[PDB]
Design an enzyme around this catalytic site. Structure first.
Site, short mmCIF file in Angstrom:
data_model
loop_
_atom_site.label_atom_id
_atom_site.label_comp_id
_atom_site.label_asym_id
_atom_site.label_seq_id
_atom_site.Cartn_x
_atom_site.Cartn_y
_atom_site.Cartn_z
CG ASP A 1 -1.71 -1.18 1.40
OD1 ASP A 1 -2.95 -1.03 1.41
OD2 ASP A 1 -1.16 -2.30 1.51
CD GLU B 1 -6.98 3.06 3.01
OE1 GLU B 1 -6.87 2.55 1.88
OE2 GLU B 1 -7.49 2.47 3.98
CG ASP C 1 -8.03 2.38 -1.56
OD1 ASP C 1 -7.02 2.29 -0.83
OD2 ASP C 1 -9.15 2.02 -1.18
CB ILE D 1 -3.72 -2.11 -1.66
CG1 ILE D 1 -2.35 -2.22 -2.33
CG2 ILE D 1 -4.39 -3.48 -1.65
CD1 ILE D 1 -1.60 -3.49 -1.98
CG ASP D 2 -10.54 -0.44 -2.92
OD1 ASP D 2 -11.45 -1.27 -2.98
OD2 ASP D 2 -10.67 0.70 -2.44
CB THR E 1 -5.55 -3.97 2.62
OG1 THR E 1 -5.40 -2.66 2.05
CG2 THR E 1 -4.19 -4.48 3.04
CG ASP F 1 -13.33 2.42 0.28
OD1 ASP F 1 -12.24 1.93 -0.09
OD2 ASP F 1 -13.66 2.51 1.48
N1 LIG Z 1 -18.18 -0.29 8.67
C1 LIG Z 1 -17.87 -0.23 7.36
N2 LIG Z 1 -18.83 -0.23 6.40
C2 LIG Z 1 -18.53 -0.18 5.09
N3 LIG Z 1 -17.26 -0.11 4.62
C3 LIG Z 1 -16.20 -0.10 5.47
C4 LIG Z 1 -16.45 -0.16 6.92
N4 LIG Z 1 -15.25 -0.13 7.51
C5 LIG Z 1 -14.31 -0.06 6.53
N5 LIG Z 1 -14.88 -0.04 5.31
C6 LIG Z 1 -14.18 0.04 4.01
O1 LIG Z 1 -14.36 -1.13 3.21
C7 LIG Z 1 -13.25 -1.17 2.30
C8 LIG Z 1 -13.03 -2.60 1.84
O2 LIG Z 1 -14.30 -3.06 1.40
P1 LIG Z 1 -14.49 -4.55 0.83
O3 LIG Z 1 -13.19 -4.84 0.13
O4 LIG Z 1 -15.69 -4.42 -0.07
O5 LIG Z 1 -14.73 -5.40 2.05
C9 LIG Z 1 -12.07 -0.58 3.04
O6 LIG Z 1 -11.35 0.28 2.15
C10 LIG Z 1 -12.68 0.23 4.18
O7 LIG Z 1 -12.36 1.62 4.11
MG LIG Z 2 -6.69 0.23 1.22
NA NA Z 3 -9.84 0.66 0.82
#
Ligand SMILES: Nc1ncnc2c1ncn2[C@@H]1O[C@H](COP(=O)(O)O)[C@@H](O)[C@H]1O
Ligand SMILES: [Mg+2]
Ligand code: NA
Length: 317
Positions: A46, A69, A118, A120-121, A123, A257
């Site tokens: 990242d 980020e 981002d 790394i989206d 992670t 995101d």
């Molecule tokens: N409570 C939450 N609700 C929704 N998204 C979140 C929460 N906490 C963190 N995230 C974000 O979800 C992203 C990853 O989403 P995913 O890969 O779809 O699980 C990360 O970059 C976080 O910033």
């Molecule tokens: Mg990230």
């Molecule tokens: Na992210």
């Protein structure tokens, strides 16, 4: 009124970014991982991607501000060490410039020209050696003009990119010179919908998406996957709908995101709103502070889905 230049820069650096992440993944992941104070992970990858990208953006467009980020506030000495080394493969920065580059990501957005990163989206999907994304977007006054998503683990490694008004396009991680057009699916019954969502239970309500889809009479089970690679599936027609469901009204989604995927789905003919059907407002800062959750679809099924989501979630607080 076009942004060819901003878009050529983004494809260029998202493609190296992908090289940077695949090579970081060639080693054991543990001694490359940090646990942020908030409990979330962040890796050598990242920080390496964000140092390289901010540097390249800053060189090319010295006046634009960056929203990204990560920061260096706390970043263990031995991780930083490895970042440094991964970085010098692709640019000549000393440990000095690297810290300064990562810390350019502190823009608050809003008016004017902002890049949105981002590094790394998802992670977690990166430690999972499954889905993850380098996500870059460019916007002006909160209006997304360019979105790039590099996804090294999706179907062989793929890059999707779009600029506003000019359509959506898919590339291999290996060749960003030859692309194909990309259009959302034509699926017109919700019973035949393939729907997607996060793998993490903290990032989406999987109990309620079950309820929503059961009401929509969906046959197939959700494909659970990490990262903005979910927007990239909608856009290329591999998935039909994408839900991100909140548990309260206080979480505000980060704009890193959502912004790159948002434009790519719309350019490929789909629709992206929140769970109340409202369009996402990317002009209120570092988060989507006037939105609650996500509905991303192929457009055909959007309102039908939103209606049932409004309702299963009318009790949030
Ligand atoms: N409570 C939450 N609700 C929704 N998204 C979140 C929460 N906490 C963190 N995230 C974000 O979800 C992203 C990853 O989403 P995913 O890969 O779809 O699980 C990360 O970059 C976080 O910033
Ligand atoms: Mg990230
Ligand atoms: Na992210």
């Amino acid at each position: 009124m076009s942004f060819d230049k901003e878009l050529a820069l983004a494809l260029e650096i998202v493609q190296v970014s992908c090289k940077i992440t695949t090579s970081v993944a060639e080693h054991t992941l543990t001694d490359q991982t940090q646990i942020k104070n908030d409990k979330s992970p962040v890796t050598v990858g990242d920080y390496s991607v964000q140092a390289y990208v901010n540097k390249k953006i800053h060189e090319t467009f010295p006046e634009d501000q960056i929203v990204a980020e990560e920061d260096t506030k706390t970043i263990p000495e031995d991780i930083f060490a490895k970042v440094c080394k991964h970085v010098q493969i692709y640019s000549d920065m000393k440990d000095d410039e690297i810290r300064k580059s990562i810390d350019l990501g502190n823009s608050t957005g809003g008016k004017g020209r902002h890049w949105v990163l981002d590094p790394i989206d998802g992670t977690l999907g990166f430690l999972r050696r499954e889905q993850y994304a380098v996500c870059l977007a460019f916007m002006i006054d909160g209006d997304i003009k360019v979105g790039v998503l590099g996804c090294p683990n999706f179907e062989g490694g793929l890059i999707v990119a779009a600029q506003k008004g000019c359509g959506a396009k898919m590339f291999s991680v290996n060749d960003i010179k030859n692309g194909k057009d990309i259009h959302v699916s034509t699926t017109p019954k919700t019973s035949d919908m393939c729907f997607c969502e996060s793998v993490e239970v903290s990032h989406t309500d999987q109990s309620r998406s079950k309820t929503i889809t059961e009401r929509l009479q969906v046959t197939k089970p959700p494909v659970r996957m990490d990262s903005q690679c979910k927007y990239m599936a909608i856009a290329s027609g591999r998935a039909d709908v994408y839900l991100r469901l909140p548990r309260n009204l206080s979480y505000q989604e980060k704009i890193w995101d959502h912004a790159a995927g948002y434009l790519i789905v719309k350019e490929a003919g789909g629709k992206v709103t929140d769970i109340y059907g409202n369009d996402l407002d990317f002009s209120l800062g570092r988060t989507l502070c006037n939105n609650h959750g996500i509905v991303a679809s192929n457009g055909i099924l959007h309102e039908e889905t939103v209606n049932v989501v409004k309702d299963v979630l009318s009790d949030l607080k």
